[PDB]
Amino acid sequence: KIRIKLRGFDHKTLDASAQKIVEAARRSGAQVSGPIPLPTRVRRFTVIRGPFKHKDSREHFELRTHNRLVDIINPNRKTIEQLMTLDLPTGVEIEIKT
Amino acid sequence: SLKKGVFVDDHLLEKVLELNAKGEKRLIKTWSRRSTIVPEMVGHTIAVYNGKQHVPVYITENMVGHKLGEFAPTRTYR
Amino acid sequence: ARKALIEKAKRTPKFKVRAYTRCVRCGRARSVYRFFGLCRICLRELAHKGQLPGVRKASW
Amino acid sequence: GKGDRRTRRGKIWRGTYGKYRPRK
Amino acid sequence: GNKIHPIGFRLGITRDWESRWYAGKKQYRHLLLEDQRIRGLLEKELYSAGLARVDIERAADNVAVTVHVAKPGVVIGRGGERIRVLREELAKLTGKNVALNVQEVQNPNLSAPLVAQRVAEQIERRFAVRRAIKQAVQRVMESGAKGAKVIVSGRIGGAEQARTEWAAQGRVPLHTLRANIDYGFALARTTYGVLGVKAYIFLGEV
RNA sequence: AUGUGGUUUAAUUCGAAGCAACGCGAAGAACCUUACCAGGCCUUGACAUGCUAGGGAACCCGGGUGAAAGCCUGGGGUGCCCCGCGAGGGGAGCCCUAGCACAGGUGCUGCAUGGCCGUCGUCAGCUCGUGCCGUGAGGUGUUGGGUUAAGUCCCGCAACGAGCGCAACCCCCGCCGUUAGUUGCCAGCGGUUCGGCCGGGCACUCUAACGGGACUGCCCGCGAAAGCGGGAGGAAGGAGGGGACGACGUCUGGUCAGCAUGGCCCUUACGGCCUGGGCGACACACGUGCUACAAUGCCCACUACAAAGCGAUGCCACCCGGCAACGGGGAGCUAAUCGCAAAAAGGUGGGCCCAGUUCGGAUUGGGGUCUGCAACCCGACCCCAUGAAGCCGGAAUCGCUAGUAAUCGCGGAUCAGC
Ligand SMILES: NC[C@@H]1O[C@H](O[C@H]2[C@@H](O)[C@H](O[C@@H]3[C@@H](O)[C@H](N)C[C@H](N)[C@H]3O[C@H]3O[C@H](CO)[C@@H](O)[C@H](O)[C@H]3N)O[C@@H]2CO)[C@H](N)[C@@H](O)[C@@H]1O
Ligand SMILES: [Mg+2]
Ligand SMILES: [Mg+2]
Ligand SMILES: [Mg+2]
Ligand SMILES: [Mg+2]
Ligand SMILES: [Mg+2]
Ligand SMILES: [Mg+2]
Ligand SMILES: [Mg+2]
Ligand SMILES: [Mg+2]
Ligand SMILES: [Mg+2]
Ligand SMILES: [Mg+2]
Ligand SMILES: [Mg+2]
Ligand SMILES: [Mg+2]
Ligand SMILES: [Mg+2]
Ligand SMILES: [Mg+2]
Ligand SMILES: [Mg+2]
Ligand SMILES: [Mg+2]
């Protein structure tokens, strides 16, 4: 019944941050459809390296928004405690849906 | 090319309309070459700026759909 | 001119189409990535330093 | 072909749509 | 004119960012401009302390700003008189609640941007441009490094023709990703124009 | 079409100059941009910090004039320090004018510079320590024999080692495993208005994190060795394929117009603001490109090949009006969920019948649509008409060794639009 989207630039601070949200609902409540990894939005920017004319020759930058997903089916209040404000957000995004 | 207005500068009209209520002046000069020549506001002589000076363009009937700057040519020997 | 102009481009103007971008550092009109407000130059610079988060050398 | 507005291909190349290339 | 920035070459590995805050595609723009005029102000009124990194994090209207320095004493003031003034100065531009840790760089001769600054400082006080380099490297090797290298640009000693002095010791393998090479750059605005100081310190590995 | 040379201009702003300038700075010149010109204007200035001084001190609403900028104006206005006074004067904010320190300059110098870049060259190199040799500069090492993509490794050797390079450490793509179920499925079985749509299921596919896998490890031949030829197993051999990555140095290379910066120059102007024009000129010359010159083709209709990215001052399904561009309405989607989205080439049918053509789509007349204050100089699109050169290109000359070239469409950045 409860749906949480997880964005972020860093793939270790999702597979960490939101794989600890799997323990803080399994231990203190009921069923979880595990963490599901979403299509990542790669942004790429492409820049003429030098300040002045050197139009061939460039540098290539991406900015990669990783997305992950978790679903919890049984809303206990034994769960919404860690999943409420036992805070360890770091450089991560939090979407909460139903 | 538009169809909901002819996007003509009020500062010109206003000055032309409130000349048509008695007005037969030649020292009418403008910088709005971007304005359509409006339904029969003819007879008058508007001087249009080419970016260097105003040129007297005598406005007759055959040339009404057009813009003003079409008669103030901006570049020399073409 | 590039002072009286970094200033002018911030003023809200008669007509929104007279409006435009500018590298909020390196104060500059052309190649200005709107996702950053950053001139390609003053940008490759930050991108290198680590001052643009999650931005990284692309290689594929 | 590709240079002709009144073909379908002229449209495609130009990215446009019209009589000569309708949206289904 | 060759050669990539050694930090930027490493960001994914053996070097992480000076700004660890996510944003959507319409906040990022402003959370950056702020992010920057921050360092613009900090670095300017905090040279004395000698700041290496100006780390930053976010989580919606609060900001980390974990400034690393050689001389913590100078940012604080005897008790807490300056660190107050700074938290106060910050929120006047940053319309948010500015937190603010402070860190000691335990050994400043292994912080490349400090070593740069050091050498740059000497140059502005017309010092022996070539020995500065020589010494600086030594100092850095002396505090236990795996290698180092320092570079100064041109107009060395106010000479008419620009030149370029360098010196180095041990390893500085700029092509190895798994190296950990703190890099740093200092200016040096002198009576006869700018010189440029670059500094490389090898330490790391697996 | 575009960039450049030249010429022309009031101006056609500046730079870039063989390779390594010329679809380059420009990842978006109608006004903005804009640095150029012509005219109307402002001068302590569009922006920063302070000083000397009468005037008002927060502020609000018009009018005249003009193209706009600006300028000449008439009103609404009395909040706060201070009580020192029970009659309110003292430059506390703040705002004005008059001076002053200053701002401002995309003015010049890349041969005063930083930085960043280009370049020889991803070429196999350039060095150092100590020892040894030489009066010395220097040499040896780094020569020699083998080998490699490689100063890669091997064997030798008055050298023994090392550093910057090479390779490796990193990303993408090939095979498999683990972890995970609003995207996958009759794979299994069930219901299906037969659209994975419905309960249901992660098997598979995929998505994205972490592992595995390759080592000349194994077999035959050559070799002193490195390594070389061949074989098996394996998705993949001997660097599996593509990136990222650029030694000491060279070019007084490039940029003072991104920025930073030493010096010199302008300060009712070399600063500023505006409207208008110019950067779009056209007797010419060159570079890079597009579309062609057709039947292995062109046109029209039907027909799932699938594959990276963008989208809430947005992507717009679906209905309707218009030949259409587009205009009305209007659902879904902060997006693996909804949209841009048709992929095109291909396939199936039908037409054309070798013609300057149903090839080609320049030029030009006319009617429109959209963005935008505004589309004459200067936008893209649609529709009618008009159909130019062009029948595969002189001397010269360019790219590419495999999922390459050739060909076909698709997306993005900048961006109102282009
Ligand atoms: N990081 C720098 C960038 O590298 C670019 O890539 C350049 C090179 O790395 C690249 O490689 C060269 C090629 O230049 C040259 N004309 C012929 C040569 N065979 C190529 O080498 C080739 O083989 C090597 C090793 O096998 C590869 O690693 C290399 O990247 C590949 N291109 O081709 C480009 C130039 O011809 C550009 N040099 C330069 O514009 C840009 O700065
Ligand atoms: Mg090119
Ligand atoms: Mg002529
Ligand atoms: Mg614009
Ligand atoms: Mg045709
Ligand atoms: Mg110049
Ligand atoms: Mg130079
Ligand atoms: Mg230079
Ligand atoms: Mg030059
Ligand atoms: Mg001797
Ligand atoms: Mg080697
Ligand atoms: Mg060899
Ligand atoms: Mg390498
Ligand atoms: Mg020169
Ligand atoms: Mg102008
Ligand atoms: Mg041009
Ligand atoms: Mg023929």
Contact flag A62-C56 (C-beta cutoff 8 Å): yes
* DSSP symbols for chain B: --SS-----HHHHHHHHHHHSS---S-EEES-TTSBPPTT--SSEEEEE-SS-EEEEE--STT-SSBSGGGS--SS--
- Looking at domain E107-206, its CATH architecture is 2-Layer Sandwich (3.30)
For chain C, what is the domain count? 1
Domain locations along chain B: 1-78
Are E9 and E177 spatial neighbours (Cβ–Cβ below 8 Å)? yes
Q: How far is A10 from chain E (nearest CA, A)?
A: 9
CATH no. for residue C60? 4.10.830.10
For chain A, what is the domain count? 1
Resolution (Å) of this entry? 3.1
* DSSP symbols for E84-95: HHHHHHHHHHS-
Burial E29-48, CB ≥16 within 10 A → b, else e: bebbebbbebbeebeeebee
User: For strand E62-63 and strand E97-98, is the pairing parallel, antiparallel, or unpaired?
Assistant: parallel
Q: What are the DSSP E strand ranges found in E22-61?
A: 51-54
Enumerate the nucleotides of strand F whose atoms come under 7 Å of any protein CB. Answer: 8-12, 15-16, 21-35, 37-38, 46-47, 67-69, 103-107, 112-122, 162-172, 179-183, 207-210, 242-255, 257-263, 271-279, 281-283, 290-293, 298-301, 308-313, 317, 323-326, 335-337, 341-342, 344, 359-362, 367-377, 379-384, 387, 409-416
Burial A52-85, CB ≥16 within 10 A → b, else e: eeeeeeebebbbbbbbbbbebeeeeeebeebbee
Nearest Cα to A5, choosing from A88, A90, A86, A66? Answer: A66
CATH 3.30.860.10 is right for the domain spanning B1-78: yes
Tell me which long-range contacts A20-23 makes (C-beta under 8 A, separation of at least 24): A20/A88, A21/A70, A21/A82, A21/A83, A22/A70
Q: How far is CA B52 from CA B28, B47, B57, B58, in A?
A: 17, 12, 15, 19
Q: How far is CA D1 from CA C60, D10, D16, in A?
A: 36, 6, 15
A72: contact with E, CB 8 A cutoff? no
Are E54 and E45 spatial neighbours (Cβ–Cβ below 8 Å)? no
In this structure, what DSSP letter does residue C28 have? -
Amino acid at C60: W
User: Domain span at residue C38?
Assistant: 1-60
Are E139 and E117 spatial neighbours (Cβ–Cβ below 8 Å)? no
CA distance A57 to A50: 8
CA distance E7 to E16: 9
Are E199 and E118 spatial neighbours (Cβ–Cβ below 8 Å)? no
Amino acid at A31: Q
In this structure, what DSSP letter does residue E57 have? B
Nearest Cα to E46, choosing from E136, E139, E113, E127? Answer: E113
Amino acid at A3: R
Ligand at minimal distance from the CA of B78 is: 3
H or E stretch at E74: helix E72-76
Q: Which residues are bridge partners to E79 per DSSP?
A: none
CA distance A5 to A19: 13
CATH no. for residue A7? 3.30.70.600
**Phi, psi (rounded to 5 degrees) for E200:** -130, 130
Provide the token pair at E143: 């505090």
CA distance E199 to E38: 24
Provide the token pair at A86: 């036992």
Using DSSP's 3-state secondary structure scheme, residue A38 falls into strand
* Number of Cβ atoms within 10 Å of the Cβ of E90: 20
- Looking at domain E16-106, its CATH architecture is 2-Layer Sandwich (3.30)
CA distance A8 to A6: 7
| B52 CB-contact burial (10 Å; exposed 0-12 / middle 13-18 / buried 19+) | exposed
Cα dihedral E89, E93, E94, E100 in deg (nearest 10): -20
CA angle E6, E11, E12 (to 5 degrees): 135
Amino acid at A89: P
Nearest Cα to E56, choosing from E26, E34, E27? Answer: E34
